[PDB]
Symmetry: D2
C-alpha cells in the first residue's frame, strides 16, 4: 500500500525537521487508508467492538523531513505492519508496529489485510 | 490570580524556532487543570461524575514568542461565573513580561446548570 | 471563498471522543497553506523570499464537534487587508453544517521587522 | 533518572488512553531533564506498551544510560503507574555539527 502526504508546518520543531514522534502519526494515517481501501476502515471496525490496540513500535531515522516535503509511506504486512518512508524515492526512515484486537480476540478482517 | 509554572518542551516548537500558537491553548488547559485541582475538585473527578466541561470559544493574542527551554507562567483568572457558563482570562509571562493574553468560555453538559459543588470551586 | 478538504485523524481526538480544540488552529493553518499555494505563493516559497507570516491573534467558536474519520471542509475568506495586516475568517463545515467559526490576524516580517505587505503577497491575498 | 509527570487531557485519544506517539514526547522531556541534571540526532526509537495511561494519571519515567560509544549513546526507559510498569522503551542518539 502506498500512502501519500505533505509535511505540515506544525509537524516540525526548532530543529527545522519533522519531530520524530510525528512519524508514528504518519504511520497511523497510512494504516487508516490501507484499511479503508480494503473496505474495512478502522472506523466501521470499532462499531463491532473491535478496537485495534498497539503492542509495540519502532522507527529508524535515516534522513530528515522538512516542512512542505512531499513523501510516501509504504505499508506492508497479532499482526505487525512494516513501513518505509520515501522522499523522492530515497528511504528516509523504516519502521514497524505490532497490533492486536480486543472486542483480546483472534483475528476475525483477517484477509482484508 | 492562579499561577501555573511551566517550561517549553522541544516538541512544542516548530521550524520557525518558536512555540506553535496552537500549543498555547494546551498551556491554558494545563493551567485550568491545576487550578481546579488546587481547589480539591480536579476536572477528572468531574468526569467520573458524568460532568463534562464544553469549550464554547477561545481567544489568544500573541505579543512576544516563547522559545525552547523558556520558563514561563500562565496567570489564570476567573472572569465570569454565570448560571450556565464560566470564563477564564489568561496572561502568559516570561521573565515578568506579558508575551500573550487569552481567554476561554465554557459550559457544562451532563446543556445543564453549573452544579452547586462546581460553582463552589470556581468562585 | 477557498475550500480546504480534510478528514479527521484518530490522534487528533482526545478522551472526550472529539477533536481537541487546539487542533482546529492546525486545520486553519493547513487551509491557509493550500490557499497560498493554490495562488502561486506557497508559504514555503515566501519563507525563501525572506518573508515570515506572523500570527497576531486567533479566535475560534465551537458549535458542534468533529469525530474520528469525519469528513469536513474549511472554507476561508479574506476579511481585511491593510498595508501591514490581513485577516482570514474560517467556517468549518461538516455535511454542509457550520460546526465552527474562527478568524486569525497576521502580519509580515522580514529580517526582524514588520514590513509593508509586498505587492507580491498583496496580489495573491485580495 | 527519575522523571515525574501527569497525563494531560490533550495527550489522550478517542479510545480514552494516551496516544502511543505521545510516549516519545515524554521520553524527550525525561531525557531533557536528565541532561540538565548533569545538535543531537535521533537514530531510532522503540516502545512496548503493556498497560495504558489515562487522563491525568500520575506516572514515573525511569531513565537509564544503557550503551555508550564514541559515536552514539542509548537510553532505556520504563514507565511506572503506581507499582506497575506500563511501558518499556529505548532510543539511540548521535551528534552532528
Amino acid at each position: 500500500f502506498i500512502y501519500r502526504r505533505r509535511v505540515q508546518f506544525y509537524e516540525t520543531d526548532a530543529q527545522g525537521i519533522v519531530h520524530h514522534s510525528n512519524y508514528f502519526r504518519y504511520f497511523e494515517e497510512a494504516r487508516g487508508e490501507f484499511l479503508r481501501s480494503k473496505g474495512f476502515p478502522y472506523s466501521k471496525m470499532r462499531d463491532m467492538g473491535l478496537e485495534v490496540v498497539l503492542l509495540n513500535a519502532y522507527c529508524e531515522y535515516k534522513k530528515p523531513l522538512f516542512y512542505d516535503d512531499v513523501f510516501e509511506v509504504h505499508l506492508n504486512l497479532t499482526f505487525t505492519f512494516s513501513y518505509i518512508v520515501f522522499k523522492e524515492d530515497i528511504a528516509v526512515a523504516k519502521a514497524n508496529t505490532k497490533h492486536c484486537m480486543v472486542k483480546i480476540v483472534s483475528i476475525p478482517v483477517l484477509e482484508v489485510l
